[PDB]
Every structure is written in C-alpha cells, then in structure tokens.
Symmetry: D2
Subunit: 483 residues, 4 copies
C-alpha cells in the first residue's frame, strides 16, 4: 500500500516516506509520503486560490448537495473504509462497521443539512434623528482551515472537523495522524471522484514537530487551526499560531471519572463502567480512568467488574466475540506498560490485568495489553491524575455526595464524566456541579451531533457541534445600515 498527499487536485509523493504498521501483528501495511514545508505551502496556497474559484461561487444549497455526494461516495465504498480503519489501528470490525464509518458519513450529512437550515440575526435600533438603523449579521467562510487530527478514531475525528469546515464554505488543509493515515487518504479519493474542485480539500501526511503538522501550524496563509489531541500539543500549537492571531479550537486530554452512587442500578453500572473504561482498548478521550463507588456497594461493584473484565475477548479485529484489539502502536504500549509498573510502585492492588496476554501466534508481535483494574491508590497518585490512554481504571470508595463531587473536580482536566443513579433529583443536582463539558447519566458516549462538545481547563478551549461549529468555521460579520 502507498499513501500519497493530495494537493491542488493531484496525488503527489514526497522525498521522504515512513511506515504504517499494523498493531495486531507488527507488519508493514503501507508506505506514507511525508509532506515537506514546500508542499505544505503549496497546499495552503491552492486552498487560498480555491476560495476564489468555482467552490466560492456555489450556492449554499449546491454546496450542501456536493457534501452529501461526498458522504454517498464513502457509503459506496463502505467496506474499503472499514478495512482501512481496522488495518491502521486494530479496532474490532464490529466497531468500525457500527460506529466509526457510519458516524463519519453522519458527520458530512449533518453539517451539510445544518448549512442549509442555519440563519443569522437582525437587530433594529433607534437613532437620534429618529430614522433608525438596522444591524444584520452574516456567516461567511473563515478562509483556509488547518485540521490536525489524532489516531484514536481516525476517520470519525477527521471528518468531525472536515465536514463543518467544508459546509461553511471554507477550503481545507488536513494532516491526519502518522499512525492512521489510510481512511483520510481514501477520503481524498472520494473527494476527487465526487468532483470537489482542486484546492478545496488538501491532504498532507507526516508528523508534528519539524514535519507537516508543525509547518501547517506555522503557515501565515491559514485562518484557523482546529485540533484534537494531547493537551501539551494543544499548548504548543496555540503558541505556534499566536503571532498570526489565528482562530483556534482545541479538544484535548482528559482524566475522566465515573461515579456510581448507592442507588445506581448496579449491574447496569458495572456494564457501563466496563464499556467506558475498556472500549477501543481504553483509547477514547471519553474513557473513564478514575472511578468512584459508594462505600456501601464498593466491594460488590469491584468483584462484578473483575469478573466481566476477565471475560473480555482480546484478539483479532474480526475474531468471534472480540471486545478489544491491541493498542495503536508498540510505542504507545511502552508508555502504557510503564504506567502499569508505576501503579504497583505507587502501592496499587492489581484487581485484574496489569500485563500483556500471551497468544502464541503472530499477535505476540503486536501491541496488545490486558484490561486492568487498580484499587488502593490515593487521589494524588500519578496513576490517578495523569492520562494513561489505555484500558485501565482505578476504583476508589466514597461516602458523601459533596465529597465525591469535589474529588471528581480535583483535576487539571475537565472533559467528561459519567454518573450512575436511579434518583431523579440526584441526576440533575449532581450533573450540574461537575466541572466538565460533557456529563452522561446512566450511559456513556451517546452523541447527538447538534450538541456543544468540548472540555474545560486543560481539556480544551471553545466548543464544536451544532451551531458552535457553524460559528467557529465562519467569519461572523455585522453590517449596520443607517436609515
């Protein structure tokens, strides 16, 4: 497999290539061409010029129709996209088929629709002379949108940025994670085949520092940088665009808590925390890595979770009852195992897992680890405060509602929280006091694309979703007419 850049309507190679590796078995999947600074410049310039071409002349309705055409194109090649996400990342085929690909299609359709229905504001005012004035606002394309995405839900998170950028009439230069370049490259093929004018969508491959990613962030030709990834990367990028005062939108790390109250439906909470800790092998930004369970049900909760975690099937993405694939890469597994060791050093009881499974086949050359549960750590332990991004959670008892609220909030992160309780008052009273951008009550990772999405503190800045994306990806202009 060879993955090229896509710049100004053409697929192009580069003077440097890097390997895409399958985490299931450590084998080479494809060669990826790393865009250099010159090619990043070429992509931004094409994007700037495309804003002045046919793309810029399309009516909102025609633009939306084209975007639905893009979505049709992905649907027409549904299984090729499934194969690509799975190859790159080792995610179970079931997850790619039911969540990943359909959601990436839903991203384009939802924002295309929003573009058609969205409107702006009219403000009347009085004036001295008594003839009055009108102020009206309009949404216009912001310009060239730089998109930089992570490896954990490659096409879903890529299209979550690209869909609204295009729906708002911008042009795009997007850099997917070096770990997961395939589905973004296939999407470039879909764009090309759907007749998207050259320069409107540009795909550049590579790394961050001193590579495609950094060059993009440094280019004076962009109008905004939207980013999803680690918090420290977010800070680095915010500094990079500071001189250009570029618009910025960041969804970043988390150290998410799940709270199980005594009045929770216990089997449901056990199933839910099992899903929220170990889905995608713990590699979702929304995963719960800290868990608080009322003292009265703590022991029973921990026993039940141990049992369920130990029935999880870890293996091939298309294996019968598979629950978990491997981690994204050997490098990431090194980091995760290092955290496994640190937890024992910090005094943790290992309730289950804590190592890597032994398959006695090619999977042993992959990047697998065991779902892991810890107990007995203090709230200030590193393993309870730092984002690990693997299939793990620490469980701690609590006694009081105000107590557990303070403990959930005692964090430099603030992305998401999940609360389990059958009590009406408690659900609402407690949810509003959690210092995060997203709370789920009695469920996890249900997403309505209309809702505002983002985090607080180190977990981000700004919101995307529904009208928040329509506002971020547009110039909002106010036009005032004296009458």
């Amino acid at each position: 497999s060879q993955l090229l850049n896509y710049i100004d309507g053409n697929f192009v190679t580069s003077a440097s290539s890097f390997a895409n590796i399958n985490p299931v078995n450590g084998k080479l999947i494809s060669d990826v061409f790393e865009a250099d600074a010159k090619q990043v410049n070429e992509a931004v310039v094409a994007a700037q010029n495309a804003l002045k071409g046919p793309w810029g002349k399309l009516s909102v309705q025609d633009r939306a129709a084209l975007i639905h055409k893009i979505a049709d194109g992905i649907q027409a090649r549904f299984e090729e996209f499934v194969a690509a996400e799975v190859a790159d990342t080792g995610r179970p085929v079931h997850q790619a088929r039911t969540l990943d690909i359909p959601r990436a299609i839903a991203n384009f359709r939802t924002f295309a629709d929003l573009a058609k229905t969205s409107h702006t504001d009219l403000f009347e005012m009085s004036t001295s002379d008594g003839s009055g004035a009108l102020n009206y606002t309009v949404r216009k394309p912001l310009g060239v949108i730089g998109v930089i995405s992570p490896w954990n839900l490659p096409l879903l998170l890529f299209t979550w940025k690209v869909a609204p950028a295009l729906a708002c009439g911008n042009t795009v230069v997007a850099k997917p994670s070096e770990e997961s370049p395939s589905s973004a490259t296939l999407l470039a093929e879909v764009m090309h085949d759907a007749g998207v004018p050259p320069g409107v969508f540009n795909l550049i491959h590579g790394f961050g520092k001193d590579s495609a990613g950094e060059f993009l962030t440094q280019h004076p030709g962009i109008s905004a940088l939207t980013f999803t990834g680690e918090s420290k990367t977010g800070s680095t990028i915010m500094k990079a665009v500071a001189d250009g005062v570029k618009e910025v939108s960041f969804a970043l790390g988390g150290k998410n808590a799940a709270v199980v109250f005594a009045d929770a439906d216990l089997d449901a909470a056990i199933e839910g925390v099992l899903r929220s800790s170990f889905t995608n092998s713990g590699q979702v930004c929304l995963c719960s890595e800290r868990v608080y369970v009322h003292r009265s049900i703590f022991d029973e909760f921990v026993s039940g979770l141990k049992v369920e975690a130990e029935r999880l099937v870890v293996g091939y993405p298309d294996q019968d009852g598979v629950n978990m694939g491997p981690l994204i890469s050997h490098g990431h597994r090194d980091k995760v195992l290092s955290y496994y060791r640190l937890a024992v050093d910090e005094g943790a009881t290992v309730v289950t897992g804590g190592g890597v499974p032994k398959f006695n086949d090619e999977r042993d050359q992959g990047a697998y680890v065991q779902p892991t549960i810890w107990t007995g750590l203090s709230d200030k332990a590193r393993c309870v405060t730092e984002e690990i991004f693997g299939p793990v959670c620490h469980i701690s008892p609590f006694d009081d509602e105000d107590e557990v609220i303070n403990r959930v909030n005692d964090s430099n992160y603030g992305l998401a929280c999940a609360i389990w309780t059958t009590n009406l008052s408690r659900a609402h009273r407690v949810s509003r006091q959690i210092h995060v951008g997203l709370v789920w009550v009695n469920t996890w990772y249900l997403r309505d694309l209309r809702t505002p999405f983002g985090g607080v503190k180190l977990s981000g800045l700004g919101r995307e979703g529904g009208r928040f994306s329509m506002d971020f990806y547009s110039d909002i202009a106010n036009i005032c007419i004296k009458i």
Copy 2:
C-alpha cells in the same frame, strides 16, 4: 498615595507607585500603586474563593439586581466619573458626559438584563433500546476572568468586559491601563458601596511586561483572559496562557478604511469621515485612517474635509467649543509625530496639520497634535498600512467597485469599514465583500450591545456582545440523560 488596588474587599497600597499624568498639561494627577506578583496571586486566589461564597449562591435574578445596583452607583456619582475620565485622558467634558460614562452604565444594565433573559437548549434523541435520551445544556460561570484593558476609552472598554463577566456569575481580576487608572478605581469604590462580596471584583494596577499585566496573564488560577489593545500584545498574551489552555477573547488593532462612492451624500460623507478620523483625537480602534473616494468627487471631498478639519477646536476639555483633546501621553505623541514625519518622507502631500499646535500656554506641556490629512501615498506605504492611532487619515482616489474592495481588503488587519453610498444594491453587495468584522453604511460607530463585535486576521480572535459574551464568559456544559 492616590490610586490603590482593591483586593478581596480592601483597598491596599503596594511596594512601589507610579505617576499618572494629565495629557492636557503634563502635570501630575496621582500616584498609582503597582501590584506585584504576590498581590496578583492574592487577587486571583480571592476571586477563586469568592466563587464559593455568597456570590456563588445568588440566583440569576438577584445577581442581575445587584449588577443594576452597581450601575445605579455609577449614576449616583456621574460627575465624579466624568472628572476622572477627563483627568486621565484629556477627553472633552461634553463627550465624557454624553458618550463615555452613560455607555459604561449601559454595559452593566444590558448584560444584567441579558443574564436574566438568556436560556439554553434541549435536544431529544432516539436510542437502540427505544427508550431515548435527553441532552440539555446549561451556562455556568467559567471561573475567574482576567481582564486587561487599554487607555483609549478607559471606563467604557473596562466595563464592556467586567459587566458580562459578572453577569455570568464569574469573579474578576482586572488590570486597567497604566495611562488611565482613575475611573476603574472609582468603580472599585462603587462595587464596595453596593455590597459586592469580597473577592468578586478585584482591581490591580500596573504595567504589562514584568508587571501586573504579565503576572495576571501567567497565573494558572484564571479561567479566561479577555483583552483589548495592540495586536502585538494579543500575540504575547496568547503565548502566555497557552500552557494553561485558557479561554481567550481578543479585540486588537486595525487599519480601517472608509469608502465614499460617487452616489454618496457628499456632505454627510465628509461629516462622517471627519468623525471617523478625528473623534477622540483619532484614538479609537474603529477610526478610519485609510479613505477611498471615487475620482469624480475626490477633489471636492478633500477640499471639504480640509475645511471642516481646520474648523476643529483643539484645546481644554472645558473650553467652549472644544472638539479634540490631547493624545494620551507624550510617549504616544512621539510615536504619532514619528509617523507624521515618515509620511512626508514617504512622499505624502500634507493637506492639513502634520504638526503640533502652538498654544502659548500650559497646553504646550501636554501631548497635543494637529488633525492631519494626507494625500499622494501608494497602497504600500507604511503610513497607509500600519496603525498610527492618531487623528489622521490618508485619502486615495479609486475608479472601480472591485478595485476598491480589493484595496480595502489588502491588509493584515480587518476590524471595521465604513461605506458611503445611496444605492440599495451597492450597499449590500459591497458590505458583504469587505473582510472585516464590522461594516457601517452611511454612518460610523453606531453600537448596539446585542450585536457580535470583533475582527478578523490581526484585528482579533472571537466575538463579544449579546449572546457571544454570554457564551464566552460561561462554561457551556452538555448533560445527557439516558431514559
């Protein structure tokens, strides 16, 4: 010993003080106590703690009432605030009485009212199990808001940030410009007398770099930094808060154009541009420093403007027919004069002004300059492209509509633009093509506080006003209930 900080409900001095100078005569007005890093920390911590006191417990209705009381407090001491603004800035008394103070009061009233009327969103969704789920959003206080403000419209711009900050339930640490500290200090006394709880509003005085401004910018305890000032400073601030990923809102420099078409009302356009160029002695972010006039009316427009400029009275804030006061400081005057010289060097024709008036009295010790009109520079001249922020404008002829639109847009700034034309189609067709956040047609500086306000490119990041402020100064949380 004149102007103190107000930290945790107490006026306090500092280790060192600095002089506040009257730009009308160069005389000492007051000594100002410069907060140190230690006092900056004390202020941020007090603001953090106030979030958890009685302020955090007020209903939105009671909070709004308390804010109207602050407004009533300013009103009760109207002339004292007038005297303070006039002293610091040399502002004509009439304009402080009619524009500055009433508008500072309106800031508090408008956002109090908005806080009471604002609501959020309810999203219903279907789920696999057929029972559904509810997503709803809430606005909560973001936390501690760091406010850094400029000297040009001291109280107006200070309250423009402080009003929505408080209306949204935040606490505040605000640093007014070293050049204009008085009206903000009086506002501290008004907050005190109205019984605003300690820690909710904190005033710190000082400079930027290596002083109170920088320190506020670097404190990990704030949740957001909203700033009005030079673009250079915006960039500097964006880098400072990057490690904390703090929310940012920037309204920065401009090099605003006025455009006068042949079908304009010529007398109204001359009067309009006179105001947009020379109001507040050209020291408003929204002033026009570039003017494009259709060739058919150019000579007449220039001759008319020269006549009206030379009828402007430059003098004392209480001088009978006074139109213009001094620049803010000798330092700013030096910069403006350096541009006056550059302009000549660049080949400009000085239509009028170009120097400093000779008063033969104490005003000669102040910081006055002449309202100035240039002609003959190219679009690439420094004086045509760099923000001067003095009472000046260059006037250039134009021939075509697409031409002038391009010349207006050919700037690294994009704050505002004024268009003069009587033609229905042209007004709306041209206005939408100008790459700014704010367009006025047949007027200038008409402000409705409900409208989105901000700029593009180097002129800013984000929007404030109406719901945009209610959103910026709030944590937006989504809460999803599985049924």
Copy 3:
C-alpha cells in the same frame, strides 16, 4: 368604593352601575360603571389613534423604561393593591402579599426586559442572476389588543396579558372580570400617574354577553383578542372574531390530574396534592381535581391528605393561620355545592368536607365551602370529568404506568398535570407522554415567565410566555431585498 372606566386618558362613569360584593361577608364593596357599546367603540378608536401618537414614536428602550415605571408605580402603592385584590376575592392577605402582587409587578418587568433583548432573523439566498437576496424579519406592534380576563387571580392574570401587549408597542383595551374589577381600576390610576399617553391603556368594566366583553370581541378595530376563562366562553369568542379573522390566544379550562407513583416521596406528595387541590380554595386553572395514586400506597395517601386537609384554616383573609378564603361569589358556590350533591348521587364516598363551614357571624353571609375529598367514583363520572373549580379532588387507585397515562389522557381537557416520583427514568418517560401543555414533577405551580404556557384540546390554543408572547403580540413581517 366607586369603579370607573378609563378611556383616552379619562376616568369616566356610565349609564349603568353594578355591585361589587365582598364574598367574605356579602357586603357591598363598590359600584362599578358598565361600559356600553358606545364607550367600547370610543375605547377602541382611542387605542387605534394612540398608535400614531407619542407612544408609537418611543424607542424600544424608552418604552421599556416607561413600562418599568408602571411596575415601580405598583410597588409604590403595594398595600393598596393587596387590599384591592383581597376585598374583591377574599384571598388570604399573606397570599396576595407574597404571590399575587409581586408577580403582577414581575409580569411588567419581565416583558419590559424581553422587549429590550428580543431580536429577529436574517436569511441569505442565492438567485439566478448570481447577485442573491436578503430576507429579514421585524416585529412590529400588532395594533389594538383586546384583553378579557377571569376573576380567580385578577391582577396577576390581567397583567400577564397587558404587560407583553404594551412591551410590544401595542395599545390595549382591557375588560377585567365583573367579579374582580378593583385592582385593574387601580392599575389604570398607576398608568395615568406614570404618564402613559392617553389611549394607550383603556379599562372597560362590564360583563360578557350583551355587555362590554361581547362588544369588545365584536369590534372590527381590534387586531387580537387574548382570553383566559371557560372553554365554552373561548369557543363563543372564537366565533365572534371570525368574520374579522382576528388573532386569538386562549387559555381555557382544565380537569387536571395529579399522579402519585409508589416510589414518590409520600409526605411531599401529600403536601403537594393538598396545595394543588386547595390553593385559592381550588379556584386555579392549574389545580388538581383528579388524583391517581398507586394501589400499594392509596389508603395511606388518602388518610394523610384527609388529616392535612382537616387542619386547613378557613376564615378571614387576615385571620391568623388562615389557609382558605371563600369562593368568589354566591353564584359560584351554588354551582360548587351542586357538584357536591352530584358526587353523592354518583356513588362517591365523602372522605371530608362536602358542605359549608359554620361561623355564626358575617361570614355565614359569605361564600365559603369546605375543602372536599371524594373517592369511589368511576372515570366516567361527571364529577371526575367536568371542571368544578372548587377546593375539591377525587382520588382513584391505579396499578400500571401505561394504565394511568391512559387515564390521565382520557379527557377533552389538557392543561396541566403533576407527577410524583423519585425515579429518574420514570419522571422523564411518563412526563413526555402526558397530553397537556404543562407538566410538573415533584412540585406544582412553579412558573418561569420565559416558558411556553398553554393547553391542548379544550384547554386552549396558542402559547404565551417568553418569545411566544413576543411573537403573538407582534406583527411578524418578512422583508425581502433583491440585490
């Protein structure tokens, strides 16, 4: 006392007066002049004219300021207003003090504030010639608003229509209930002293059919009729305005259910149903005249309610621990007692009440009845289906959730419903299935003036509240500009 009409800025008498009876003791409170057709027309013509006077020239900010002055004016004669409502209706003094009057003031203040903050819409569209078009909307005064109101919460319900009517720049012709004309007459005094331009607010006294009410409804000079009263009266008025195609807003009768599930907090539910049943002696449209209680807790619930019910103090508005006053009138008691009998004939067990109290003083000349609880009736019984509007409820057991939902919904009415449960899923699942405009969970008659308020089926049409009022009381116009 003497109650005059207020027409074109003048208090005026008429050719006929009628008696205002105090129902505490049957004494004559005042004579009320009955507007005749000539006076009604005179009122409508003045309101029409007033639209082109100073009122119509007021900015929205000035209009809201005056409206707040109306509110200030009520606050300044607060006790006079309490006295008035109490005199007319027998309402407990505490209740008029803390609820009735403050809320009438809140009506003006809230709609004044909404008027200032409300805005409209801008829609951009592409056109064949590639130049496009703009559609914008504006709210304008609808014109002359006819207001006809009931006797149960005189000032509150009066001002609920008058406030938004005036806040939207309309003029008003208002016909208060013949039973409760006092507080409205006082308000006319407040309007006058506040300086409300003559013709802007007109008060007309009289009855419905063949009287002022009817004449108002038949007048071609009004633009809308907003009504609160009996559903049959609503249908009558609907036919009256049909030839003129007038805009209509109806809040009509109900036969509201309270539902108590087994997982309710029983003590709070007992207290809640006590209030929803007997507040204002059961003379609120929102009262629960039907109650369904889970079988498992039915007997305990009835016993608790009986006890709490028998603790209710029925006497003087000023009497010490007073809980109930009399019904509004002897005529109304005749109807209520007639139902008391009907319930017996129908098979009801009288758990408590069912007659009239005995005072051996002037009150025996009043219009008092006993708080009553029935049991043992069929869902098809008249007493359980028809609105009584007295301090009465029937309690029936239920077993299944879908069963009780069906029984609540089995009604030609559909105003409000109260649900008692501590279960999260249940609260939300059941509430959405109740076919009414207003559901309360674990409380009753909590009112936020921003929310949409109204009923379904016979209980009304349209919604008022928040933007629904801003919409109903304005002309919405769409202006389309071809560019």
Copy 4:
C-alpha cells in the same frame, strides 16, 4: 380517467363522482370520487390510529429519511406530476416544470431537514429551598392535521402543508380543491409506493360546504385545521372548529399593491409589475392588483406596461412562447368578467384587455381571459378594493412617500407588497411601514422556505414557514422538574 380517495392505505371509490374539467378546452379530464361524511370519519379515525402504530415509533431521523423518499418518488415521476398540474389548471408547461413541481419536492426536503435540525429550550430557575428547578420544552405531534387547499398552485400549496405536518410526526387527512385533484392523487400513489404506513396520509376528494371540506372541518377527531383560500371561507372554517377549540392556521385573500418610486429602475419595474400582475393569469394570492406609480413616471410606466402586456402570449400550455393559460374554470371566469364589467361601470379607462381572447378553435370553449390594465378609478372603487384574482391591475399616480404608504395600508387585506426603488434608505424606511406580512424590494415572489409567511388583517392568522411551521404542527410542551 378516475381519481379515487386514499384512506387507511387503500384506494377507494365513493357513491358519487364529479367531473374534473380541463379549462383549456372545457373537456372532461376525469371522474373524481366524492368522499361522504362516513368516509371522512374513516380517514380521521385511521389517522388517529396510525399515530399509535409504526409511524409513531419512528425516530426523527428515520421519519425524515422516509419523507426524503416521498420527495424522491415525486422526482422519479416528475413528468407525470407536470402533466397532471397542467391538465387540471391549464398552467403553462414551462412554469409547472420550473416552479410548480420542483417546489413541491423542495417542500418535503426542506421540512424533512428542519425536522432533523430543530431543537427546543432549557430554562433553569431558582427556588426558595435553594435546590432549583429545570424547565425543558419538547415538540410532539399535534395529532391529526386537517388540510384543505386551493386550486391555484395545487401541488405546491398542498405539499406546503402536508410536508411540515408529516415532518412533525402528525398524521394527515387532506382535501384538495375540486378543480385540481390530480396531482394530490398522484401524491397518494407516491406515498403508497414509498411505504408510508396506512392511516398516516389520507386523501379525501370533494367540495366544501355540505361536502368533504365541511365534514373534515367538523370532525372532533382532528387537532388542527390549516387552510389556504378565500378570507370568507377562512371565517367559515374558524366558526366550524370553534367548539373544538382546534388550532388553526389561515393564509387568505389579498389586494396587494406594487409601488414604483421615481428612482426605480423603470424597465426593471415594468417587467416586475408585468410579472406580479399576470403570472399564473393573475391567479396567485401574491399578485399585484393595485399599482401606485410616481406622477413623474406615471405616463411612461403605463405606456410601457401596456406594450409589454399586449406582447404576452395567451394560449396552450405547451404552445411555443406561451405566457398565460386560461383561468381555472368557467365559474371563475364568470366572476372575473363580472369585475371587468364593474370596472367600466365604476368609470375606469381600459388601457388594455378587458374581455376574452377569440381563438376560433377549441380554446373558445375554455376559460381564457385577457390580461387587463385599468386607470382612472378612485381608491374607494370596488375594483380597487376587492380581490378579483384575475390577470388585472389598476394603476394610479402618487406624489409623496407617506401619501402612498397610507394608500397601500388603507385596505382590509394585508398579505404582500412589492416596492421598486434604487435608494438604500427608502427601501428600508418604506418597507417597514407597509402593513403586510411580506414585502419584496425590486423583485417579486422570491421564496425562502425558512422565512415566516402569512398575512395581517383579513389576509390570515398565524405564520407558517421555517420554525413557525415546526411550532404550528407540533404540541409545544413544558416539563418542569423540581430538583
């Protein structure tokens, strides 16, 4: 050809039929089965029942997809729908191809989209106990929607109601005009083939009084009646549904003015008024039957319009350059010619037209009239005040802006107005002062489906379009949770 009813998923005949006539030549097109009261009852009951079946269980997204399939089905049989509208009404083929059928399709697509993107409101409130409460609103299906539509733009106006009705989850019983039943019947075929569940959409054929229309209007099983037609018919229907207090939405007659100011683009205005007067042979509710032209250009405008009118091709729907077809029916022509006579009797000068064209072929048995222009009548003449709904306009001079605004507003109707001017201030100043629901400047009949559409005074009640439809075709319910 035979047109059956569609009831509960079955095409059904009836006891009696009536003839559908081609107005082009007076020939029989089809026999149409007239629904009787018994069949109307079956339809309504099927519709109530369908709300409780599969239709009522669809997610909003699945409902929207099914509605896009309905639209697809119309698209797939596009030319059959064209032929049907033309046969019924004599509409030029070009207009049916470019305007009539594409809009019918757009109606379904737009409201399907609005249904996916629409959301409701969250209101937080404080309470005495300090724990607070939530109010959230939801949109539910109103229930069974009765739709009665007119003959002028049959499928367009029919689907304008049926689309939002279904998009909002209602079931429908629809009665198209007796003059134009074909496309509605084809629409029922598309519904059937698309798999729309039985009872969801029901088509009943017949007349109004003493027929299907009247019976639908009287059935207590409907929840709303939405109507487009004559004002007097609207009044009749309003009385009919009054005992049931049914929600109603009316779009009724007009007597629309066009105004041509001295600064208009004269040739553009002549062409505009030509179109607004004679499109669909003057048979659009939005047509201009009154025209006011500035005195300075009156004679030239009138001479210009005469020439352009006499250039119109009146003939067969597929005739080479055809501009106008016949009126809908001989009955309607009888009324139109009656007004032609009356105009003469009232003292009108006939500038052109005023009779019937003579074809000397089968068209002479049709219902054609000549496009007609009058001059010289008083503002009080009946021909200038009463809706004719033919291809006619009267033209009168004016001098002053306020003068003409008053003359336009001096009507019992208030649907629309077209204004012609090149002046920015005038466009906006004059448009806001016209008492109508819709103004166009320098164009006519430009429709954005997101905009509020409707009239004032006799021209209607309520608004439809965008969120106004989403609100009208839904139950708005407020749910209040005590926390």
